[PDB]
C-alpha cells in the first residue's frame, strides 16, 4: 500500500537525518519526527558553531518534511480523521504553501 510506503520512507529518512546528526557525536542537536532540528539545551557558542550543517543538509531535511507532511495528510485521510475533500484541500494547501 502506498500509505505504508510513505510511513516507511518517513522513518527511513528520519533515521538517515538522525545518523547525519549523530555523525560527529554531538548530542545537543535533536531531530523530531516533523523534521525540525532543535537543540536539547541552549547552545553555547562553541557548540553552536561546532554543530552546523551546510545548505544541502537543510534542503534534504526540508524536502523530507514536505514528503512527511504529504504522507501524514494521507494517513489522516486513512484514519478517518479528515474527509476526502478535506484531504484534497490539505494537499493543495501543502503544494501551494
Amino acid at each position: 500500500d502506498w500509505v505504508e510506503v510513505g510511513l516507511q520512507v518517513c522513518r527511513q529518512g528520519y533515521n538517515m537525518l538522525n545518523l547525519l546528526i549523530h555523525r560527529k557525536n554531538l548530542n545537543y542537536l535533536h531531530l523530531d519526527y516533523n523534521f525540525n532540528l532543535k537543540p536539547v539545551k541552549t547552545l553555547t557558542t562553541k557548540e553552536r558553531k561546532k554543530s552546523r550543517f551546510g545548505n544541502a543538509f537543510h534542503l534534504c531535511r526540508e524536502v523530507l518534511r514536505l514528503t512527511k507532511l504529504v504522507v501524514d495528510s494521507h494517513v489522516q485521510y486513512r484514519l478517518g480523521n479528515v474527509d476526502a475533500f478535506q484531504l484534497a484541500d490539505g494537499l493543495q494547501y501543502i503544494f501551494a504553501h
Partner: protein
C-alpha cells in the same frame, strides 16, 4: 630528521600529543570510533 624513513611503530599523527578540531559537522569523515 629530514631524509629518514618513518619508524615502524610510530603513530602517524597525535604521537606528539596533538589535538584535532571539528569546526563543523559536515567537514571531515564520520568519527567511526
Amino acid at each position: 630528521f629530514l631524509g629518514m624513513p618513518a619508524p615502524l611503530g610510530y603513530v602517524p599523527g597525535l604521537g606528539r600529543g596533538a589535538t584535532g578540531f571539528t569546526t563543523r559537522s559536515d567537514i571531515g569523515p564520520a568519527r567511526d570510533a
